[PDB]
Amino acid sequence: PEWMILEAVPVLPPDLRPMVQVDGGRFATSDLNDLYRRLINRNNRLKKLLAQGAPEI
Amino acid sequence: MEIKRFGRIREVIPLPPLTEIQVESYRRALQADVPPEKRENVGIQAAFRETFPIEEEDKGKGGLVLDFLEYRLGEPPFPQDECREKDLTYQAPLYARLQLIHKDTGLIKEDEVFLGHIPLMTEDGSFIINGADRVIVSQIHRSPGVYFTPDPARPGRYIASIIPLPKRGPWIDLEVEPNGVVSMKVNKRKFPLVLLLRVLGYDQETLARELGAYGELVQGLMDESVFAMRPEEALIRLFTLLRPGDPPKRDKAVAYVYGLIADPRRYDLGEAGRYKAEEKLGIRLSGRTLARFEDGEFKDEVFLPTLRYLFALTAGVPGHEVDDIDHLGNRRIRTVGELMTDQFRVGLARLARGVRERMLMGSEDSLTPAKLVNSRPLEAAIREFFSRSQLSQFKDETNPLSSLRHKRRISALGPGGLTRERAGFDVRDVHRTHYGRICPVETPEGANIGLITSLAAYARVDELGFIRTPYRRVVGGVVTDEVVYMTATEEDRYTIAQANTPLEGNRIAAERVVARRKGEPVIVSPEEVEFMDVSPKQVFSVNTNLIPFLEHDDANRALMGSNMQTQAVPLIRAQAPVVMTGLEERVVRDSLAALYAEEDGEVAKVDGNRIVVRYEDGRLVEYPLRRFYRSNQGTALDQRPRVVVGQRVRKGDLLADGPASENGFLALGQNVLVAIMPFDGYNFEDAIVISEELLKRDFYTSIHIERYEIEARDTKLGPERITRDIPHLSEAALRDLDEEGVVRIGAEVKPGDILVGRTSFKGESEPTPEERLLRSIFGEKARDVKDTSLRVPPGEGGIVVRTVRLRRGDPGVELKPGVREVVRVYVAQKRKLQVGDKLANRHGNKGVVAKILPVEDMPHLPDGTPVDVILNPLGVPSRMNLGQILETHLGLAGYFLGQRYISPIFDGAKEPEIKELLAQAFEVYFGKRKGEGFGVDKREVEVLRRAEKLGLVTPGKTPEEQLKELFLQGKVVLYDGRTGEPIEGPIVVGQMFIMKLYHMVEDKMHARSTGPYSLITQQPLGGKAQFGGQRFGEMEVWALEAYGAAHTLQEMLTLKSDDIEGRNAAYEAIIKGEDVPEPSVPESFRVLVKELQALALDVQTLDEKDNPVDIFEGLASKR
Amino acid sequence: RVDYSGRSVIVVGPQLKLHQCGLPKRMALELFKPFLLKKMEEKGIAPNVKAARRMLERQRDIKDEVWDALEEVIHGKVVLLNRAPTLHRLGIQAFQPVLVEGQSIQLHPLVCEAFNADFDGDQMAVHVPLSSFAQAEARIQMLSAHNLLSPASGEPLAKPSRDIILGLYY
Amino acid sequence: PQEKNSLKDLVYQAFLRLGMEKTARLLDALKYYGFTFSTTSGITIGIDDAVIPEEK
Amino acid sequence: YRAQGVKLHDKHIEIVVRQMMKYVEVTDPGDSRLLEGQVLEKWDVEALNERLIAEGKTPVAWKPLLMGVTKSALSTKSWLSAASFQNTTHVLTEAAIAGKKDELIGLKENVILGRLIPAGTGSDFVRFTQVVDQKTLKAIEEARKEAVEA
Amino acid sequence: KKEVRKVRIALASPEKIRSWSYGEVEKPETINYRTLKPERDGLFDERIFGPIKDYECACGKYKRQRFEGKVCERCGVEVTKSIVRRYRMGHIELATPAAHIWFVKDVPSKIG
Amino acid sequence: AEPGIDKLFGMVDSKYRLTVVVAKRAQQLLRHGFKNTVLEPEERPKMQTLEGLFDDPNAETWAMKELLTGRLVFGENLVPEDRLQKEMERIYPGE
Amino acid sequence: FNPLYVMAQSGARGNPQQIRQLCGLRGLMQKPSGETFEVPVRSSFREGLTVLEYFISSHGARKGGADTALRTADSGYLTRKLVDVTHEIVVREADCGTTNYISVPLFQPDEVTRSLRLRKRADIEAGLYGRVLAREVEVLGVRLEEGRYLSMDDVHLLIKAAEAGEIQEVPVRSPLTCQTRYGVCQKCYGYDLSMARPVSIGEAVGIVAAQSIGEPGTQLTMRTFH
Ligand SMILES: CCC/C(C)=C/C=C(\C)C(=O)[C@H]1C(=O)C=C([C@H](C)CCC/C=N/C(=O)OC)OC1=O
Ligand SMILES: [Mg+2]
Ligand SMILES: [Zn+2]
């Protein structure tokens, strides 16, 4: 059961959610990275906060 | 030859301007040219008078005046034809006289703001978007008014409703489980309607008591009389109906808004639903929609009639005002003008939002003019609109009709509030009101069927977005040339006799007449009649009308014809039918295909490239003749002079035949000897055989123009270039492309040659170490430059004809960012007829060229003349498309009778008349015979004997004579060009007007083996000079499975598609002439696994021993 | 998407024999390029691969014997024709192709049955059974000339249809 | 007279009575002749063939 | 179909039918619950452990079940197929918890996978059939007397 | 060299999870724009997912296939087909546990 | 068309069985040049190219023919996994 | 020998409805609502139609081209289900051993209140062709080994036999009664139907049946009509 909870978030191989240059100086990607991003951001932020013995709120 | 017209219906008036719609809708929406900004805002200027006066006045800061004054525009930056060249959008900037004042009566008026320019409509009616000929489809909708739809759910009663049309306007609906609930639904929230009744200033008494009279059932109303005593109370309370929670301060917040603001009004000042509502609700209203000014409170002459009417309806027989939605009298059509204006408003309102966000940090008077301005928002809106509009689509100029008919179409697709792809079966239906308004028959075949239609030739739409149809007034048997356009509703009011009604002078010629009462198929003695159809034609779409003997083929197959005519392509040897309905001539004019004389004079000069003429007065107007030019669909579009020097000519006179115009008549094809009969199954199923002769006569030969492009990108890895100097091996491969980068015009190119030479740097300009060595062994100059030149895609090419080069062209080039310069090459090719092309007659009879026969074996008549095409007869019975038959029959007479005919639709020819002409012709065909010392072919006898056994001929008659009898049945005797022996049985032969159909590059002949691969899915991807792979789907999987070809299906999807390593290994294997390796896992799946894993989901491949298995064979196993 | 696939419009081949089907050389060519290539090499005409490879890159430089070989390869082999919608297995069938002129596919009249499709414009898809094994299944249980009865009713699917009957009837 | 069914039935039997492959031969045979004849058959379609019976 | 003049042998249908009957419900556990509606055949080991196989003499009363094609298949033993259709999540989620194993008895699965089809040529029954020439039937002798060293 | 006959589907042991990750993403950084470089410890840090150029490290200290699979003592990136980049998986370590929705919004909400 | 096809079926219990069979013969019959066959020159798949008759290379053709002549034997389980290749690689070196 | 006649008759092309329209009366056309019209379409196609005539007809013309679109566009919809539902089922065994079977009738009761009535051959054939006999069968002086496959003729015979009021039901091995594990044994299936012989093992029947059903679908009256 414990398994249904998370603390170890998997990540797709790069070439499956690639980042490629396209037109005259621009590129494209998958939303994931983005999703992925924001996520990471949050978690790492979090760390500090705890590391900051901050208001549990 | 001589043209012979038929039928005798006296068309009181000729047809109306066609593109007329597009042209005026727009014309009546700009008010540019002759409009002095005088007395009208009907469209854009109204769009103005609404986005104005925009204020931001706190009586404290006092005056913060900013109103409209005058709109303006007029310098098309560049010329149409030029716009197309540089992918521009023909249009003109738009200035505007405004006015900003100050509490200090500071009236500073910066009378200028041309930030935004808008597209213009061609002389023909289309538009030029980024060089692309674009078209706008006028779409229909549910006219703004009041209606009473039988409540679906409960088969007991019905729901009434209202519809003003702003983008943010009201949408009323009523219903009731009445005991108390006067179910008044608003957005998604309803309640008792009574509460509103008092806010009006009327209580249960003045209302429910005096009205709820005949409506004794007004109990479904009167439930809270106390709430009905002081307007103010119910007044406030109602706000409740809205979220979240605010104080009773805004005594008239959402009120004044639903009074005299853009919301309530359907149209401006009633016009829309006033006539509706009013004529269906007693009398007029309060001003325009609901408004009440110099009193404070609000008078509603709205719900007033409404409610009581639902009553007058939820009653016995007080008007029985049900509402047939599909009824045209209840559906409006939005046209370009209108259609665009609204879009003009959005980005417009989107600017005011902007301007209001400026009063905030706006200085005392450091704001006056356009420091408060920005087009971009509005600029985008409209721009975005056209360019990316669902109803904005490339001009279909396959030919003219094509282009023209395209304009005449009507969409039901578009507005996410006025259009829905939810298949409205009965909406796709052909409603009675369609008569003389929508082409009952013309509609795209396909899931878009019944959603896209053409306009009934004579039908016309008034500024109110309503169609109307021609009708002549009748007077007790007397027919008046006094016509009367009319709408759907008004129509139901009368009794309409069919045009074709026998007559005399004007007196009707019948004791009983054929008519329809509001779509009522009835018989009636003359006196009873009120109006008659002007001409059959008024019913159908234009091209639909182009069909001869329409009244003989089933509408369905007929549908095909129309559609097909639009897909007809311009032959070099253009030809109009040996028989026409009558429009052909009128068409070319409106289509704007050929050139006519705007006055009389002498033919001055007329070289192939241009014509000039002197007018009576003495004016020399040289007319630049658009020469060979590409069609949106690439077809050729050229006009050809038909007049000569010194030749005098009057107004309306032609000068140069458009692409598909002959003598000024539409020539969507060629007339030819078809002989209907089976020919060794080469015409098996729709299949059509052809006399090789035709080709020799370059009959079916067209000229397609194809354009290619290439880009000069200032790459990060260093810019690439267009040079004749490339890392290429050979030279013979440069023979023609020697013009310092470009290929010399007029060159016979073939798939694989270089239209243009280009070079850049690959692998991030890093030469392989492997390659390194090799290269050195023969002069290792690792030119970091990769040849990336433009080649002729496979399939076919043709010969160069023109080359245009844009180098950030200072003259007006707007190269895409990253692009240094571009290039364009145009290649032509006389696509001639060959096995495969598809042909069609105006009679939905379509089919492909199955085989080309040698004129020899080709079936011919005794006079050794071979026909040109053989038509299997089977494709008729199951088609009931006789029309063509007759067309041929007559097609045969005029053949010898060296003439052409004009048979009207639901009029024209009649078996006798035809049966007649043949007789004449029989003379030519036969008659001469003896005058040449010639009798009857022995074989001819052979047949005849048989012929009469088929009761074709009346026995005992003179052999010779019998023939005639036969001839009259349109059949003649045919000899097999192969065996010589005649054909056991007469054969109906004769002329038929046929068309060659357009070839979609998508319909091109594709064939892949291996090439590009979607960077992700890792599945066959098609390049430019490289084909794509076939979409192998479940349906095909299923089929395969059924058989049991395990391997195939496997390799099919693995090797042949998603299994990487495989294919290569595969290739190689094959190459070395070896067998094939086995299939691993398809990326698709692997990928899948990952996705799962990415979703925190272990997926485990296991064996019997239930032991995990790595599908990645390593690159998965870590540490 | 398949690799050795192709598509074109169809035409009727009264000459064709049940198990045959006309195929635009040009088109054929690509589909077998590799095999072909090999043969080439296998014959003086082609020293090595890249040779033939480039040697064909351009139609203009497409010699004669080329075709003469191409055929050779083909001998025995068959392919698959699809005309969507593929509703019943016979929506696919195999035939030993015969090289043809023009850019169009010559379909055998009898099969037009299952391949419910007429020559009013219908196009078809072609596929090449690669591995020896694929070819096998194909040439065996998928040859048009091996499925005459209907798997549903059991009746002669491939049978006289229109023009034929009439004649006979006559 | 030979027609759809008659033929059909005939075919089935063929397929049965004798192997499938030979049957094919038959088909083609049929195909062949069926065609050749139709062409020569002198069977067109004139509006006159739309024979309208009098009982109408 | 017949009413539309469509000639179709019964079989085909009958086939599709058996599947609706494919699953059945329970009333007598033995070791399972009641909602359990399962693929009928599991009974010759399970329902045959009656008084003979396991000899445990623990009966298994059940109930005949009739479900629509949608249903039936959708409830397959093979989780893949089941997921290959609408409501992919649920399917999985369940199969996950149960850590279901998908055998490759059916096609779709075996296919979507990348493995050789279960039937036709993919039917084991024949898959393996061996073949060598008579010229090789003389070859056996080698390793057949590759023991007679004088 | 052999074949399979059974597919499995079980939840993922954070262990198992970690048993896959060829590293852990700690940095959001996508790619450096000035040179388009898989940001270190970022989402494309090929140190985690692998060479972008088959058989070749980052700093390039290693190239030829003649270095079968020897990690870089410098750029810390392995040497092999860059192809593995579309197959290798990395992870993130959650400061706090987070629930997998498919066991919540799916009803019965398994867990609850 | 396809000769003996019917008869070909009449020589197996299962339709598909036959296929498999043939296939495999082809493969091997390929992997070892062609000396493997069970028939003389008189009877051999041919072709008319370059004005003449030269052995046909389409294995199936060959495979199919041989079977007809009972000069060959299949079966569910005939022999050990490698003795074939083995003994078989000796008799006809192919290569 | 008139063309048309010849055609339709030979079945080479065209049926009655089609002709009736061409040669004489197009007949009645019906309204969008669906209610048939009161006045008919007298004209034959040869005669030529009235503007009015022509118009009125069209409605069905729409619904016609309409209705079709829904299946022609796609109808696999059906098959799809079936597929998803019967793919796994395959010819796996030779004999499953099922002692039980099913018995196919040759008569129908309630056409009138329970009176009996023989079935039409087609139907019957559709039900017994290439079937495998469950139990032996003594008839018309001839017995039918139980386990014997039903050739076409055989059936007729029987058909003939029941006419001699000599039989009613028919013992035949079926799928329903087949005892195979998610597949079927060679016996409970019978003939192949693409070939008139006993089906060979490893046949993709599930899929086959599904298709056999789906395909036709595209040509069945969609919405109820009367
Ligand atoms: C839980 C979802 C499983 C799933 C559907 C995964 C799809 C993936 C990974 C793809 O990309 C696939 C895809 O799009 C399409 C296909 C082929 C063309 C069709 C197979 C269907 C067979 N059908 C039957 O045999 O029917 C009885 O296969 C894929 O793997
Ligand atoms: Mg078609
Ligand atoms: Zn390194």
Ligand SMILES: [Zn+2]
């Ligand atoms: Zn069984």
